[PDB]
Amino acid sequence: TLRPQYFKEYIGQDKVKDQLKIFIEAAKLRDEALDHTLLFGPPGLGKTTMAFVIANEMGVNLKQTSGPAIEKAGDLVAILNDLEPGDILFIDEIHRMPMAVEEVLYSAMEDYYIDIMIGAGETSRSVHLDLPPFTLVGATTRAGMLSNPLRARFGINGHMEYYELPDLTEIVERTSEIFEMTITPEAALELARRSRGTPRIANRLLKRVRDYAQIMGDGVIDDKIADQALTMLDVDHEGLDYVDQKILRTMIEMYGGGPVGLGTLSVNIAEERETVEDMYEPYLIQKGFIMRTRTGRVATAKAYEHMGYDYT
Amino acid sequence: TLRPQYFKEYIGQDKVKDQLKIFIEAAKLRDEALDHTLLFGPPGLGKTTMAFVIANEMGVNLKQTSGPAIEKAGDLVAILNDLEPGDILFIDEIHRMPMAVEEVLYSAMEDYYIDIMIGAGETSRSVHLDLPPFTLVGATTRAGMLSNPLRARFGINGHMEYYELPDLTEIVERTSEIFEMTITPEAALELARRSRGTPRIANRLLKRVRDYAQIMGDGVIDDKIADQALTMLDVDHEGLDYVDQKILRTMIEMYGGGPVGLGTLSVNIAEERETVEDMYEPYLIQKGFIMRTRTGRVATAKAYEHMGYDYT
Amino acid sequence: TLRPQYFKEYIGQDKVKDQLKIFIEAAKLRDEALDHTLLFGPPGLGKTTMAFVIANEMGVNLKQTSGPAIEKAGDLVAILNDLEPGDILFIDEIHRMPMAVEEVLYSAMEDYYIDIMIGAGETSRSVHLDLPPFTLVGATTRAGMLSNPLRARFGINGHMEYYELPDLTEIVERTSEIFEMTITPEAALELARRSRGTPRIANRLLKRVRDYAQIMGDGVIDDKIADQALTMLDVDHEGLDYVDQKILRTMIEMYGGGPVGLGTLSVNIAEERETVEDMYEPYLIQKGFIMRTRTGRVATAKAYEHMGYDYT
Amino acid sequence: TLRPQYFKEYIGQDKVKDQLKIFIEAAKLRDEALDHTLLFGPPGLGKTTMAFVIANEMGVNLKQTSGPAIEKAGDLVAILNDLEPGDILFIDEIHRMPMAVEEVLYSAMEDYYIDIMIGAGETSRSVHLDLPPFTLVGATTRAGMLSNPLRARFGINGHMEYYELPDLTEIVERTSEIFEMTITPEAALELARRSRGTPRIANRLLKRVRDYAQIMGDGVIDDKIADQALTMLDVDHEGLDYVDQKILRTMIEMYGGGPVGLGTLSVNIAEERETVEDMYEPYLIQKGFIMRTRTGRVATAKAYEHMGYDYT
Amino acid sequence: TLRPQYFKEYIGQDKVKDQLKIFIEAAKLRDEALDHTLLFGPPGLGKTTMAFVIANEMGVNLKQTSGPAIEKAGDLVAILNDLEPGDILFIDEIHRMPMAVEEVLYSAMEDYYIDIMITSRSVHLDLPPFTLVGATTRAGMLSNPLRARFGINGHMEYYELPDLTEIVERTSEIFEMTITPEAALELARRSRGTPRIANRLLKRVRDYAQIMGDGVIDDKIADQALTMLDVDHEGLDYVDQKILRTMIEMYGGGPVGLGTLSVNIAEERETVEDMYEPYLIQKGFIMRTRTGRVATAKAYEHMGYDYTR
Amino acid sequence: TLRPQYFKEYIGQDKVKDQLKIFIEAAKLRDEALDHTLLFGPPGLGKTTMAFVIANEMGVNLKQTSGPAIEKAGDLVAILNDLEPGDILFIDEIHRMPMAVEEVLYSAMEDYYIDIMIGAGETSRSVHLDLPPFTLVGATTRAGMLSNPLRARFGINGHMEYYELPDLTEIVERTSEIFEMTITPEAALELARRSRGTPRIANRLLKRVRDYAQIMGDGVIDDKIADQALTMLDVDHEGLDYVDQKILRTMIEMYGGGPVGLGTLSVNIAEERETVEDMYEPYLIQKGFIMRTRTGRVATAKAYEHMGYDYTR
Amino acid sequence: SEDAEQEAVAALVALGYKPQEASRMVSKIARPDASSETLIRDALRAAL
DNA sequence: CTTCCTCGAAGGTTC
DNA sequence: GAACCTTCGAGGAAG
Ligand SMILES: Nc1ncnc2c1ncn2[C@@H]1O[C@H](COP(=O)(O)OP(=O)(O)OP(O)(O)=S)[C@@H](O)[C@H]1O
Ligand SMILES: Nc1ncnc2c1ncn2[C@@H]1O[C@H](COP(=O)(O)OP(=O)(O)OP(O)(O)=S)[C@@H](O)[C@H]1O
Ligand SMILES: Nc1ncnc2c1ncn2[C@@H]1O[C@H](COP(=O)(O)OP(=O)(O)OP(O)(O)=S)[C@@H](O)[C@H]1O
Ligand SMILES: [Mg+2]
Ligand SMILES: [Mg+2]
Ligand SMILES: [Mg+2]
Ligand SMILES: [Mg+2]
Ligand SMILES: [Mg+2]
C-alpha cells in the first residue's frame, strides 16, 4: 500500500518518530490512553498518514471524521456518544470547525464531560455526559486558526519538516516496488532532486515517468528515459518551471541582478502581482536563488551559475 | 452534431493532445482510470470538447456540473453517489466553488471515500462512504486562482492556446462541411482571420454568413459576400468587438491613453471586472493593442492609428 | 392594442429590424427554429414588443416570464417542460435570475436536454429530459452584468437605440389616432421633442395632455395648449424631468458643478443609484448635459446656460 | 486532586486571592449571598479552578452550565427557575450566549425577577417571576465581547495575572506528588523556568519528562534525566521552542537585526504569516526579545547575548 | 430603597428633570395623558429609575414588560388589550422587539386603534388614552417611523462631582454606614461619573471597613481600601495605568497601532478597544490619529513624566 | 382632527395639488375613474393625508390597508370584491407587497378582471372574475425597488416636497387655533424655521412650547416666551440639537475638519455607532454641513460659518 | 354541478387557499346551483 | 441580519 | 522617486 502502516515503514521525520515512540511505549506500560496530539505543518509532508500509524501502534480502532463534516454542535455530541474506552478520534482539517463547536471541546478534552440541555421543553435542565478515556488526534495545515485555549489543551505537538535527498530517494524506490517498475538508482536520485522535498510531488512525477516509459520505452526507468520524460514535463534539474526560469532570467538580463521592485518585475513577465509573491517566489527564496532586500530583490550567485551567466 | 468526438477529429492543441495520448493509452493497458486532470486557459478554446473526447476514448460516461452550481456539501455528496465505476466528472469554473465545499473533495480525490453525517436528532450518525473509481476534470482560467491543497492533488496539467490561421481555416472548412454549404478558400481565410482566434466565434459568424448568402445571395460564400455580411455586423476589419472598440476609445479620450487601472476602467465602461480581465484584455495584450506598465494599462500607437486619433 | 404586431408596423430600429428580417426568413426556408436572440438597451425602447413581433413573424406561440419570478430550478423545469416544438420563450430581466437557475439553461440552450437531481436522503437519483426545439429570447437593461458563460450562448444580438424626431412624430400621431385625439403637426412635433426620445414616455405625456385640453380647450391639442400643459407637468422644453432638474441643480449649487460620483449624488437626492445610471445618466450624456471625467461627472456649459447659471 | 479545593491549596494570585477572602468573610458576617463575580484573563491561569474554590469557601452547591449550551431564552429561564436560596450559578465561556439572551439577565441580576409571557389568546399575560437570592459567577477570556450593560452589573472583577518562578516551582512539586514521582528541587526549578509562567504548561512538561524518565531512565527525575529529556524536547533554558530560536537566528544573521517585515521573515523560515504572528511572535515581544517599530521587527540587545552573538 | 421615588429625591439630570416637571405639571392641568416618552443614553445613568418616577408623579399604576419577552404580535395585542384609560405602559430594552411588532405599534401610538386578523376574521380594537414609555441604549436601532411618533425625548448626561458626593452619602445612610464628607468625595472622583459605579465602590469599601477596621469609613480606611482595589485618584485601573506607561516609555508617546499595543501588554485587541480606550479618550489622555494613537500632555503630567514635544 | 379634508385646506404641495385637481375634474367630466396614482417622497410629508383628500374630492368611499398586511392573493381579490364602482383602494408601503401578489395585481389594474387557468395543458379551462372599475392609489418611500411592469401600469406620479417657511408657518398658525392658544406671527416663524421642513415636527415643537408658555408664563406664545422655550430645549436656530452641535464642534476643534472615521467620532461624543449614522448624520448631510469620503466624514465650509470658526482650505 | 363546485374549489385553491379550508369555504355556501363565477365570487367575499 | 475581514488608500522612512 | 512597511477606514459575504 502507498501509505506506510507502521513506524518501521515510515521513512524520515526522525524528530517526530523518536518522540512518539517514547510516549506511545510509556502509555502502554501504564495501560492508559495516549495524550491528545496535534499534527501540523506544510502541505503533503505526511500528517494524515502519521495519524493512522499512531492508531496501528496503539492497537485500537480508529474513528474518523473531519472539520467540515461537523456543521453544528449537535453533530459533535452525537460522535462523542459513540466513543468506547480507549478509542482514538481523528479529526482532519480541524481548523474548519466553527467556533461555536470548538468551544465545546474545551470541557471534553480536559475533564471528559459535556453540558447538555435536556427535557420536554416544559421542564428542561442541564445534565452532564460523562465520556470514557479517549485520545483526540488533530491534523491541520495552519495552527494559527485554532483559538489559543484549544492549542493549549493538546499534550503532544508534532511539527513536520521537509525531507532530505537521502530519505526522499528511498520513498521513490519504495513506490517503484509497489508499481512493479524497475528503476535505476541514478534515476531515483534525479526524480528526488526535482521533487521540492515533498513526498506527494515525488509520487506524481514517478507516475508520469512510469506512463511514458511503458508507452515508448522498454518498461524500465533507465537514466536515458528519465531525462527524456522530465524534458517533456518541462521540469528543470532544480525543479524550476518555465515561469521560474523566466523570473530569474529577466532579473539577470534586464536589471543586472537587481535590486528590482515586485511591481516592476511583475509587469515585465506578464504575471499577476500576488500570484508571483505567493505561488512562485517562496520556493526561490528558500532555495537561495533570490534574496529580498530593503531596496528590492536581488538574484544571488547561485542563480548566475545555474543559468550560466557570469557573476560580477 | 458539430462537436468533435475523437482525437483524430480534434484539430490543433497538438501539445495537449500528444501528452493525453500517452497518458490515456498507458491507462488502458492497466485496468484503471486516468488521473485527475486540470485544464486551464482562455475561455471558448475548446476545453469542454476535450472532456467529451477523453470520455469517448476511455469508453465511459461523462457527467457535467459547475462550481457555482454547488452551494452545500449535500449537493456534492449526491453527485458523487451517482457515478459509475470509471465515470468522468467535469467541473467547470472549479475555482469559484466554495471553500467549505472544496475541502470535501480532498478525501474523495486522494482516497475515494467521504466522511458524512446522516440523519437528524437521535438518528444523527457519521457514515464512511466508499466511492468507486472516477476521474475529475476541472477547468479554470489561471492556475494561480486555486488553493495550494487543491492544486497539489491534480495529477495532469494542460495549457490551451489560441488557434492560428491555418487551423481556424480548417475548422471553418469543416464546419461549412457539416452544413451542406460551399465556401471558397478566400472566404474561409477571411472569416478565420476575423474570428479572434476562437473556434466558438468562427462557428457563430459562419452561421450568420450562411443565412445572408442564402437570402441576399446565391447560396455560395465568396469574399464579396463575407465582407458584406461581416460589414453588416459590428465585426471590424480585424475582429475587434464593439466592447473592444469601446475600451480603446474610452482610454484614449477619457484617460488620455493612460495609465489607468482595470478596476477604475471597468466601472467607467459599466462592464464586470472579471469579463474584461478574462475575455477581452488578454487578446488586446497578445496582439499589441494595449500595453501593460507598472502603473497600469497603456494604449499603444497601434491603437491610436486603428481608432484614427493622433498619437501626440 | 397600441403596440405593433408586424415589422410592417414596427417603426424605427432599422438595423435590428433589418437584421432579424434576414434571419427570420432564412430560418423558414430551412424549416428550423430561430437561434437564441438577446435584446438589450435602455428601458422602454421596445424590447418586449420586438418579442411579440418575432413570434408573429415566425407564427409561433409566445410564453412569458421574468428573472425575479423564477426562484428555483424546479420552477424553470416546469416551464421548459410545458413547451411545444418551435415555441418561443421570452425571459425579461434575464440578468437577475439566480446562479442556480442558469445551470439548467446552459444544457437546454446548447443541446435541448437537462439533468435534474431528484430525491433526498436515501433517495438520490437524476432524470434526463429531452426538450423539443425552442428559441430563447432574453431582454435586459444592463448587458455588462450578464454572466460571461451565459452571454456566449446567444447567437444573435440586438442593440436597441434612441429614436429620432422623424420616427417619434409618426408614433405620437399613431397613438393619437388610437385614442381618437386630434393633434396638429406642430403639437405632435413638440411632444416628440420633449418626450426624451422614448416611446413609453411619449405615450404617458399624450394621455396627460388630453386631460388638459379637455378643460383648457375644446379637446384639440394645439401647439399653444400643449406648451401650457407641458409646463404644468414640470417637463422642460429639453425633456428634462423633475429628477433631471434636481440632479443638475444640486451639482451646481452644492458642488460647483462637480466632479461628483454617481453614489455621492444619489445620497443627497432620494433616488437609487441604479435608476440614475439606468434611466437618467445615459440620456444626459448623449444630449451633452453631463460629461464624464477621471473624478466623475461635471455639468457642461450647455447645462449651465440652459439651467440659467453662469458657467465656470 | 489535581485542582486545588480551598484557598489554603491555591498558590499565587495574591491580589485576586487576597481580595476574594475579604469579600467572602464580610458576606458571611451579614449572612447574605455573595455579590456577582466575573473572572477573566489569559488561558490556563486558574479561572475555572477559582470558581469551584469560591463555592467550597462559601459552603454551597455549585450549579454548572456553559455559554455554548444555552441557545434560546427558554433554556436560561428554565435554569433560573431551578435555583434555590443561596445557590451559585457558574457559566463558563459566558461570551458565547446570544445577545438576545444576555438581555434577559439584566433584570435578573439587579432586581431578581424576569418578565415572562404566559397563557394564550385572551388568556395571554405578562407576569413577574421572582428569583431567590443567588450569586452568578462567570469566566471568560474575551471580556470585551460582553455587552456594556452586563459588565456593569458584576460587582466583583477578578483579572488574573501570570505566576512567578517560586510559585511555579511549588506547583510542579505538588503535581509530582499526585503522580508517584520523586523530583529533585533543582529539576523542579529547571522546568518551572521554562513554563512561560503558566501552570498548565508546567504540568505538561512534567508529564513529558515523566514518560522519558520511566522509558529512557530509572523512573526518577534528577538533574541528569531532566537535562536529557529537555534536550530531546528541544526547549531552550529560556523556554524558546525550536522555531522560536530559528526566528532570532535568521533575523540576526541575514538581516543584521532588522528592521524587517513580517512577510519577509515568514518566507525565510518557510512558515506562514498567520502562524508567526499568532503563535510565536507574542511571547518573544512580551519577554523583550523582539521590538515592533514603524520600520519592522528588530532584535533587542537581550536577544544578542542569549543566542551568543556580538551586539555591534 | 436604592431607587428614588420622586423628583425631590432624584439628584442631578437638571436638564431632563426640569423639562419633565413642566410637561407633567401641564398635563395634569389639562387632565390629559402625557405624550409618549423615549429615554436613551449611556448605561447606568438612571433611565429605568426615571420611568418609575414619572408614573408616581402622574399618579398612575405602571404596566411593565420588556422587548425580549414580546416575541409575536399576539403577545402585544394581549398586553395592550388590558390597558385602561390613563395607564402607563413601560417597555424596557425596546430595541429588541421584532419588526412584526413595531409595525403594530405605529397605529396604536398615533391612532389609538389596531386591526388584527383573528374562522378567519378581522377584529377592530379601539384603545383608550394611554402613555407609552421606552428606554434603550441603542436609539439608532429603532425604525425611523417609530422615533418620529415619540413626543418627548430625554437624553441622559453624566453627573458632576457635587452630585455624586451627595449620592454616596445618601446610599451610606441606607446601609447605615457612617462616612465623612472628605471620604465621600474621594469615592466620587473615582466613580467615572456613573451612579452605579459609585455604589459599587461603596459596597466594596464597606466590606473592607467591616473586616479590616471598626466598621466606620474615615479618611484613613478609605485611603487603605482604595489602595487594595488599586484605583487611581483619576479613576484609572491597574491596566489603564499600564497602557499609558507602556506608550510613554516604549514608544515615546506614539503613534502606535492598536495591534502592536495590545500584544505588548498581553491584552486582547477587542478588550483594549471596547473596554479600556473609551474612558481614556473621553478624559483626553489619548487621541486617535491617522497613523495611530498618541498620549497627550495630560497623560504625562498625571503619570509623572517630563513632557517633550 | 389635525388633518385637512379638502384641497381648499391642504396647505402647500402646490405642484402635485395642481396636477391632481385638473385630472380629477377631467375624469369627472367623463364616466371614468381616476388613473392609478403613485406618491413619492420622504416620510411625514402628508402622503396619507393626501389619500383621504383624493377620496373626498372624488366623492367615493375609501378602503385603507398596507402592504405588510397582504399575505395572500385571496386577500387582494376579496378586498377588491368589496369595492363598489369607482371605489378607491389605498395601499401604503406598496413596495413591501410579496412578489406572488404583484403578478396578480397587473390583471386588476390593466384589465379590471382576473382569469385563472387550470389543467395539465392537454385538458384545460379558465374561470373569469369580473371586477368593478376602481382606482389604486399607492404610497411608497422607495421608488427604485418597484419592478418595471408595475411601474408601467401607474399613470400618475406625484413628487412630494419639503414645505417652505411661508407655508410651514401657516401650518403652525392653523394648529395653534385648534388649541386655545394665541400665537404671534413672528413667533410662529421662529418655530417653522426650526421644524426641519416637516409638518409633524412643527406640531411636536408647538406642543412643547405650549406646555412651557402655560406653566412658566401667562398661556400666550409671544416672541419673548418663544425665545425662552426655544432656550430650555437646546434646538439651535438652524434646528440643530445639542448633540448635533457637539458633533460639528468636535470635528472642527479636534480633527481640523477631518477626515475622521465613524468609530473615532462616536467614542468622542460617547454615542453608539448606530445612533450617529442613523439619527444625527442624515440631516447634517442634507443641510450640507458634512460629507462622506472613503477616508471618513469631513466638515464643509458651510459648517464653519455656522458654528463661527475661521476656515482655510 | 360538480364541475362548478370543483371549479370554485379549484379556482379558490389557485388563489392560495388551502384545499381543506377552500373546500369548507365553498362547501359552506348554501346554493350549489349557482354559476362557478358566483360561487367563487361569493366565497371570496365571505373570506373578508 | 450580523460578524468578520479584506480590499484600497496614505502617511512616513530610506537609499 | 522607487520601494517597504504600518495603519486606518469603509464594504460585503459567510455565517
Ligand atoms: N514518510 C512517508 N513515506 C512514504 N510515503 C509518504 C510519507 N509521507 C507521506 N507519504 C505519502 O505522501 C502522500 C501524501 O501524504 P499525506 O499524509 O496525505 O499528506 P498530508 O499531510 O495529508 O497533506 P495535507 O492533508 O494536504 S496537509 C501519500 O501518498 C502518502 O502515502
Ligand atoms: N478543435 C476543434 N475542432 C472543431 N471544433 C472545435 C474545436 N475546438 C472547439 N470547437 C468548437 O467549439 C464549440 C464548443 O466549445 P467548447 O468546447 O465549449 O469550448 P469551451 O471552453 O467549453 O467554451 P465555454 O464553455 O463557453 S468556457 C463547438 O462548436 C465545437 O465544434
Ligand atoms: N399639508 C398639510 N397640512 C396640514 N397638516 C399636514 C399636512 N401634511 C402633513 N400634515 C400633518 O402631518 C401628519 C402626518 O401626515 P402623514 O400623512 O402621516 O405623513 P406620512 O407621509 O403618512 O408619514 P408616514 O406615513 O409615517 S411615511 C398629519 O397628521 C398632519 O397633521
Ligand atoms: Mg491529509
Ligand atoms: Mg463547456
Ligand atoms: Mg476554564
Ligand atoms: Mg434599566
Ligand atoms: Mg404618515
Residue numbers in the entry:
A (entry chain A), B (entry chain F), C (entry chain E), D (entry chain B): 19 to 330
E (entry chain C): 19 to 136, 141 to 331
F (entry chain D): 19 to 331
G (entry chain G): 156 to 203
Authors' own words:
The central and universal element in genetic recombination as well as in double strand break repair and in the process of replication fork rescue is a four-way DNA heteroduplex called the Holliday junction. In bacteria, the Holliday junction is processed by two homo-hexameric AAA+ ATPase RuvB motors, which assemble together with the RuvA–Holliday junction complex to energize the strand-exchange reaction. Here, using time-resolved cryo-electron microscopy, we obtained structures of the ATP-hydrolysing RuvAB complex in seven distinct conformational states, captured during assembly and processing of a Holliday junction.
Only two states (s0t1 and s1t1) could be recovered at high resolution (3.3 Å) from this dataset. In both t1 states, only a single RuvAD3 binds subunit D in the RuvB hexamer, implying that states s2 to s5 observed after a 5 h incubation (t2) are indeed actively generated by a progressing nucleotide cycle. Given that ATP levels typically exceed those of ADP in bacterial cells, it appears likely that in vivo RuvB motors first assemble initiation states by preferentially loading ATP stochastically at RuvB subunits (s0 with four or five ATPs), to then enter the processive sequential nucleotide cycle (s0→s1→→s5) to promote branch migration. Finally, our findings reveal that RuvB motors are most variable in the converter, which changes from a hybrid conformation in the initiation states (s0 and s0t1) to the spatiotemporal continuum observed in the nucleotide cycle (s1–s5).
